[PDB]
Symmetry: D2
Subunit: 258 residues, 4 copies
Amino acid sequence: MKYMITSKGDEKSDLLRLNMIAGFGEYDMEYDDVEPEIVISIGGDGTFLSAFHQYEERLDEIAFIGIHTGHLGFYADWRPAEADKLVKLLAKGEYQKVSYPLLKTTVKYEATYLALNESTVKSSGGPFVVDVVINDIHFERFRGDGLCMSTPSGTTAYNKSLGGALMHPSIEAMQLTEMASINNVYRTIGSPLVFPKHHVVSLQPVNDKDFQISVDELSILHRDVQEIRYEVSAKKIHFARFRSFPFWRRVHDSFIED
Amino acid sequence: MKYMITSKGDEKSDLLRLNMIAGFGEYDMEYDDVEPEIVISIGGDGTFLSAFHQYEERLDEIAFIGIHTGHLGFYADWRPAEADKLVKLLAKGEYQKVSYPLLKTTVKYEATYLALNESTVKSSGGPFVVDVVINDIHFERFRGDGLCMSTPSGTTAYNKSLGGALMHPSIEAMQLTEMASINNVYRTIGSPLVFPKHHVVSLQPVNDKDFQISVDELSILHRDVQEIRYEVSAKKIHFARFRSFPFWRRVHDSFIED
Amino acid sequence: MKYMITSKGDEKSDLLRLNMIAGFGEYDMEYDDVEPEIVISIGGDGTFLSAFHQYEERLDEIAFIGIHTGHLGFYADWRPAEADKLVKLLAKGEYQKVSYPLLKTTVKYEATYLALNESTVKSSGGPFVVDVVINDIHFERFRGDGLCMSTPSGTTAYNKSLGGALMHPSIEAMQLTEMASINNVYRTIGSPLVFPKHHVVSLQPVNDKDFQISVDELSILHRDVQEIRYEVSAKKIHFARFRSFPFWRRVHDSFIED
Amino acid sequence: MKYMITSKGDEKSDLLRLNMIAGFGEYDMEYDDVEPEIVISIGGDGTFLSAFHQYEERLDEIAFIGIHTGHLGFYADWRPAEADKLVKLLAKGEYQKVSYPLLKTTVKYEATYLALNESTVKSSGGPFVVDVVINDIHFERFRGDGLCMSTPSGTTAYNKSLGGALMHPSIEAMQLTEMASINNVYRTIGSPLVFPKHHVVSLQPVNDKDFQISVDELSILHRDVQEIRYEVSAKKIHFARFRSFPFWRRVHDSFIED
Ligand SMILES: NC[C@H]1O[C@@H](n2c(Br)nc3c(N)ncnc32)[C@H](O)[C@@H]1O
Ligand SMILES: NC[C@H]1O[C@@H](n2c(Br)nc3c(N)ncnc32)[C@H](O)[C@@H]1O
Ligand SMILES: NC[C@H]1O[C@@H](n2c(Br)nc3c(N)ncnc32)[C@H](O)[C@@H]1O
Ligand SMILES: NC[C@H]1O[C@@H](n2c(Br)nc3c(N)ncnc32)[C@H](O)[C@@H]1O
Ligand SMILES: NC[C@H]1O[C@@H](n2c(Br)nc3c(N)ncnc32)[C@H](O)[C@@H]1O
Ligand SMILES: NC[C@H]1O[C@@H](n2c(Br)nc3c(N)ncnc32)[C@H](O)[C@@H]1O
Ligand SMILES: NC[C@H]1O[C@@H](n2c(Br)nc3c(N)ncnc32)[C@H](O)[C@@H]1O
Ligand SMILES: NC[C@H]1O[C@@H](n2c(Br)nc3c(N)ncnc32)[C@H](O)[C@@H]1O
C-alpha cells in the first residue's frame, strides 16, 4: 500500500517521521504523497486537519492515522511510543476502518467546501445580520457576532466554546451554535440545534452581502454572497483503527483528567 | 378501529371530546379505553404526557393524536378547529405513522421506566454527588443540584432550560445536561452530551444513596439506590400524521413567533 | 480580649484548636463562647459559615478569623502553619478590620434572616412560579426551579454555579440569578442582576404559597408565605486582617491554580 | 444656556430637531455646537453614543438628553411626544442632574479613550491569546475570540449578549466578560468579573502584539501593542433628569414587554 507522512515541522516530529519511513522500508510499502492509501500525520490535531484538506478529494481511498507528539488530540490519539507498532500493523492491511461524518458548505454569488470540524460565518466588519432558513422555511433573523455549524467530531472544538453539546461521531448530524446573539427587535432560538442528514440550513444576507467565512483552519472574506448552505456531507472520513480508544474516553482524558 | 379520548378537564376540552365521540359514532369506530388503537388527547402537552403513560405498555399497538385547546404544543399540535377533519381521516385508517425515540431508565437497589420527555436525578435534600460512568468507564464525579437525561422530542422541554441543545426527533439519541454543577475538587464536562443507541450511562452514589428521581411528570423519592442506568429505548412512540407539521416549524412557532 | 474557637470536628482541627488555646493561655486572653470579641473557626468555609450564624446577633462586636485545615477557602484563608503567628498578632489587638456586606431576607405570612453567602427560593414540589417586583414595580413573572440572591463574597459559591458574576466584596450589593427558567407564555430577563444598597427585591406567589427557602446552610419549608424581600443589609461582617490576601488572588488560587 | 442638537439623519429626526430649535428660539437659549451646556440627541442609543464622543472632552460642563424617534433606548428614553415639554423645562435650568460611570482604556506601545458602553479586544486574525493581570498579579492566560470590559450602563449592551450581568448604573464599577474561551492547556475563570473603582485590569500579549480594539462604536486595529489597561474612569457622564424613569423600568420595557 502506498503511504505518506506529514510532520508539524519541529525536531521531534521530523525525527519520528524519518523513523517510521525507515521502519516502513523494512516492508512492502511505497512512499507516495500524490496517491497514498495511508496518510499519517505527526504533531497535533492541527497537523491532522491540514493532512485532511491536502487529500480531501480522495477521502474514500485513504485511511488516516494521527500521532500526537504533544498532548493528546482528538484526531491525534496515538502516542509516539506506539509508532513502531503502527508501522507493523499497517503493513498487513488487516486493520479495520472507522468513518466520521463531514459537513458540506456551499457558497453562492458557486463554491463547495468540506469541513472536518466546523464552518463559521461572521461579518466583514460592521453588524452581522442573516436570515436563517431551515429546509426552505424561515426560522429566525440572527443578529450578533456570527454562527457556527459543526460536525460531530468537531463538537469538542469551537462548538464547545460556544456552549454547543458534545456529540458522538457515530451520529450523522451537524450542530449550529450562536455567537453573542442580541435578544430583545430580534429574537433567536438561543439553544444550539442538531440537524440530521438531508436537512438543509441556509443563511441569507439582509443588508451587507460580505461575510468572513471559515472552513476548519482556512478563513476567507467572501464578497457578494447570496446564500450559504449547510448540510451533512455524503462523504465521510476514514480512519484506520488498531485498538479501542472510545470517543468518550478521549473526551475525558482531554477535559477532565489524563 | 377501537379508540379513546382524554381531556384536560376544563369545559372547552370535555365539549370538544364529546363532539369527536359523536362524530365518531357516525363511523365504524368503537370506543375503548382498555385496548384502543387510537388515543386522542385534548388539552396541552401535559395532557398528552399522561395519555402516553396510561398506555405505555401498548405503545406498538397505538397511534397517538394530540389536540391543543390552548397554545400550540409539541405533542398537541392540532388546533380544535381541525377536529372534525381528524375524525374523518382517522376513520379510513389510511393515515401514515411517525415514531419518536424514548428513554429507558433503570433503577437498582429493580425498576424500569419509559420517558417521553426526560428523566432527572436530584438529592433527597443535602448535597448531590454521583459518579458518572459511560459504557463502564468512569467519566466524572458530579457535584451539584442534579442531572437531566432527555429524549429528542424532550429537548424542547426541561433540557432546553438547562442549556441543552434542541435535537430533531428522527435522531435516535439521548442528551444529558447538568444542573448547577460546582467546578473547582470536582470537575465536570460542563457541556451537554448526546449519546447514540446502545450507549449506557450509569449514575452511582458516592455517599447518600437516596435520590429524588423523575420520569416525565411523575417524581418519586427512591431509597437505597445503587445504580441508575440510562439508554435509548428499543421501544418507540407512534403518532398518526395527517399532514406536514415540521419539527422545526413547531420549534419556531413555539419560541420565536406564531 | 475574650475569644472562642470552633472546629470542624476531625482530629486535625481539634488538635490545632487545643494548641491555639494553649498558646493563648500564654497571653492575657480569656476564652468565652458567649460574649467573645474574637471568633476563630478551624476547618473549611462551612465551618466558618456556622461560626457566623452562631454569633450573627453580635456581628458589630466581633472580628472573625478563618483557618483552613484542608484546601484554601474564601473565608478560611489562613493555613494551619500560620496558627502560632495568628495567636501572637491577635494578642496585641493592633490588627486592622475588614468588612463584607450581608444580605437581609424577610419572610411575611414576619421573619428576618442574615445571609453571608446567599438565600434561595424553590417550590415545595410542583411548579415554582413567582412574580418578581423591584422597588415596587413588577419586573417579571418567573417560572422554573428557583432563584438565588447572593452577597458579594457569596458570588464565588452557589451564584457562580448559576452563571452569576464574581463581584468584589468591597462593592455593597446583591446579585440575583435564575435557576432553569422556562422561556417561551413566560419571559424572564435571563441575565443575572446586580442591585445596590436600598433597592428592595420582592417575590410574590402566583398560586402555591409554600416555598423551600434557604439562608446559607439552613433550609426550611415555609408555609403560607405572602412575600419574600431581599435587600443589602445595614449590618456587615468584620474580619481581622493581619496581611494582604487579595480577593482576586483568592479567586485565582481557588479556580485557576494554587 | 448654550445648547446643540444632533439627529439620526432621517426625516422624522430632522423635523423633530428643527422644531425643538424653533421652540428654543422662544426662550433665552443660544444654539452652539462648540461650547454647549445642553446636548440633545434625536434618534436611538447609537445617535446618543456619537453625541457623547463628539463632546467627550467637556463631560463635566454638559448635561445630555436623549430622545428616541423609534423603540425605547437606554440613553434615548424620552418619546418625541414629550419634546415640547423638554424644551420648556430645560429653559429654566432648574433640572437635576444624574451621573453614570465611565470606563478608561489605556493603550501602550500611549493612547487613552473613554467608553460609555464598553471596550473589547480581539485578534488581528489568527489566534487571540492574552495574559490577564489584575492589580499587578497574574490572574489567567486567556485563549479565545476576545474579551469585553463594560460600564454599568453598558451592561445591557454587548455585555448582556456575552452572559454578563446587568448592573445598576449607580454602582461605580466595570465588568469583564469572555468571548468563546477555550477551556482544557488553558484555563479561564469562565465567570464574568465585576471590579470596583481603582482596580486596574491589564491585558498583555503572549505572541501576537496586534489587536482589534473597540471603544463603543469606533474600532481600530492597533499594532505593536504592549499593554491594554482598564479602570473605572474618574470622569462621569451627566444627564439632565426631568422625571422618574427607573433603570430597571428601562430594562423591563426593553427586554420583557413595553
Ligand atoms: N486537542 C486540543 C487542540 O487541538 C485543536 N483542535 C482541533 Br485543530 N480540532 C479539535 C477538535 N475537533 N476537538 C478538540 N480540539 C481540537 C484545539 O483547537 C486545541 O488547540
Ligand atoms: N483554527 C483551528 C481550529 O480552531 C478552533 N477554534 C477557533 Br478558529 N476558535 C475557537 C475558540 N474560540 N474556541 C475553541 N476553538 C476554536 C476551530 O475548531 C478550528 O477548526
Ligand atoms: N408547550 C409548552 C408547555 O408544554 C410543556 N411541555 C411538555 Br409537558 N413537554 C414539552 C416538550 N417536549 N417541549 C416543550 N414543552 C413541553 C412545557 O412544560 C410547557 O408547559
Ligand atoms: N412537569 C412536566 C414537564 O415539565 C418540564 N420541566 C420541569 Br419538571 N422543570 C422545568 C424547568 N425548570 N424548565 C422547563 N421545563 C421544565 C419537564 O420536561 C416535564 O416533562
Ligand atoms: N471553598 C470551596 C468549598 O467551600 C464552600 N463554600 C462556602 Br460554604 N462558601 C463559599 C464561598 N463563598 N465561595 C466558595 N466556596 C464556598 C463551597 O461549597 C465548597 O464546598
Ligand atoms: N450548603 C452550603 C453552601 O453550598 C452552596 N451551594 C449549594 Br446549597 N448548592 C450549590 C451548587 N449547586 N453549586 C455550588 N454551590 C452550591 C451555597 O453557597 C451554600 O452557602
Ligand atoms: N436600544 C437597543 C439598541 O441600542 C443599541 N445600544 C447601544 Br448603541 N447602547 C446600548 C445599551 N447600553 N444598552 C442597550 N442597547 C444599546 C443596541 O445595540 C441596540 O441596537
Ligand atoms: N456598535 C454599537 C454597540 O453595539 C454593541 N454590540 C456589538 Br459592537 N456587538 C454586539 C453583540 N454581538 N450583541 C449585542 N451588542 C453588541 C456594543 O455595545 C456597541 O457599543
